Amino acid sequence: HQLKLLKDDFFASDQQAVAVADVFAEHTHDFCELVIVWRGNGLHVLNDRPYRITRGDLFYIHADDKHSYASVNDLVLQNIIYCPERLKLNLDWQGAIPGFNASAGQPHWRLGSMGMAQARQVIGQLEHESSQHVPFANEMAELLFGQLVMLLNRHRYT
Amino acid sequence: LKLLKDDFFASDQQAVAVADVFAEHTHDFCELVIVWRGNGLHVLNDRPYRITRGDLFYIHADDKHSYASVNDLVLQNIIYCPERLKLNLDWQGAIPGFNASAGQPHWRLGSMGMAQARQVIGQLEHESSQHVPFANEMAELLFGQLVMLLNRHRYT
Numbered sequence: 001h002q003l004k005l006l007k008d009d010f011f012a013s014d015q016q017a018v019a020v021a022d023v024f025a026e027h028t029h030d031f032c033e034l035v036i037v038w039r040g041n042g043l044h045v046l047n048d049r050p051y052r053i054t055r056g057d058l059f060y061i062h063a064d065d066k067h068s069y070a071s072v073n074d075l076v077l078q079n080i081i082y083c084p085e086r087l088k089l090n091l092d093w094q095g096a097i098p099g100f101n102a103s104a105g106q107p108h109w110r111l112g113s114m115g116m117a118q119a120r121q122v123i124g125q126l127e128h129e130s131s132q133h134v135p136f137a138n139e140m141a142e143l144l145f146g147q148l149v150m151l152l153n154r155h156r157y158t
Numbered sequence: 159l160k161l162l163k164d165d166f167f168a169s170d171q172q173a174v175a176v177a178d179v180f181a182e183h184t185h186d187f188c189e190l191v192i193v194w195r196g197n198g199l200h201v202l203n204d205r206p207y208r209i210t211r212g213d214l215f216y217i218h219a220d221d222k223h224s225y226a227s228v229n230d231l232v233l234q235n236i237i238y239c240p241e242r243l244k245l246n247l248d249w250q251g252a253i254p255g256f257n258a259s260a261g262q263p264h265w266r267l268g269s270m271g272m273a274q275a276r277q278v279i280g281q282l283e284h285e286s287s288q289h290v291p292f293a294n295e296m297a298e299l300l301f302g303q304l305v306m307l308l309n310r311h312r313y314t
């Protein structure tokens with residue numbers, strides 16, 4: 001049987017385009033996500049391909065990807081989930097994000113110390129902007145998501 | 159005396175920058191002024207403001223103004239060109255003085271507003287480089303964030 005995570009269950013409203021979600025059973029989605037490993041190590045199985053993951057790993061996941069994770073030792077990761085069709089800003093999302101419209105040709109990247117530092121700073125702010133009661137929080141969140149996406153594009157390597 | 163974007167911006171493409179007695183002048187670009195500490199005088203369109211920590215001004219290009227430090231006045235000017243901003247944000251909706259002189263140019267920020275503004279402006283300062291990939295886009299995204307934060311926190 002399939003397990004498909006639903007944006008209806010993972011986003012605060014129909015307007016919210018991005019959220020910070022943070023083992024995990026095998027699943028697919030109807031939204032996309034960026035995965036960053038903050039520390040420890042473990043296993044990420046993406047479309048039946050196993051990756052031994054560790055601090056600095058970055059994955060670009062499309063909705064139709066099926067994946068699971070397992071912590072081997074002290075795994076800490078973060079998933080930044082987003083709905084491509086909900087984004088309003090005129091950044092070239094598809095040009096900056098593998099996995100935007102279909103499975104990424106190269107889903108797996110790494111980040112150096114500076115990229116991790118800048119991602120950390122942006123993601124921490126993005127976590128605070130989840131409130132659906134604070135006026136225009138969704139727009140603030142999208143600007144932060146834009147910064148993260150550009151920073152990832154700037155710092156990522158294979 | 160009129161300050162010109164050609165002298166104040168790193169390139170034709172930079173839409174926003176953090177600028178480095180400042181005599182009376184006008185500009186061909188707009189700006190936000192935030193006062194961090196000390197105190198002084200801001201004369202805007204011939205109207206004198208005693209300024210200090212927490213003061214925020216929205217300046218339009220046509221505005222004529224001068225400053226004078228009374229006691230170690232420390233401020234920053236976030237300069238921007240409306241015609242250069244490429245991000246599809248509702249800029250004029252968030253920024254008084256965007257299209258013409260502001261009806262209310264003078265605002266204040268509390269302690270939390272100031273800390274968040276300072277954080278973003280520090281980041282925006284670090285995206286001045288015209289070499290680093292996506293610096294101009296990052297500058298606009300950060301200026302977008304700044305402007306929304308100021309909107310959230312400012313009061314008269």
Ligand SMILES: C[C@@H]1O[C@H](O)[C@H](O)[C@H](O)[C@H]1O
Pocket residue numbers: 005010021022024029033078079081
């Ligand atoms: C939304 C959901 O949240 C979890 O953090 C997990 O990592 C999944 O991969 C993701 O699909």
Ligand SMILES: C[C@@H]1O[C@H](O)[C@H](O)[C@H](O)[C@H]1O
Pocket residue numbers: 161166177178180185189234235237
């Ligand atoms: C850009 C220019 O440089 C200074 O920062 C000064 O504060 C002026 O007000 C500003 O117009």
Ligand code: NI
Pocket residue numbers: 027029033061067
């Ligand atoms: Ni997932």
Ligand code: NI
Pocket residue numbers: 183185189217223
């Ligand atoms: Ni000025």
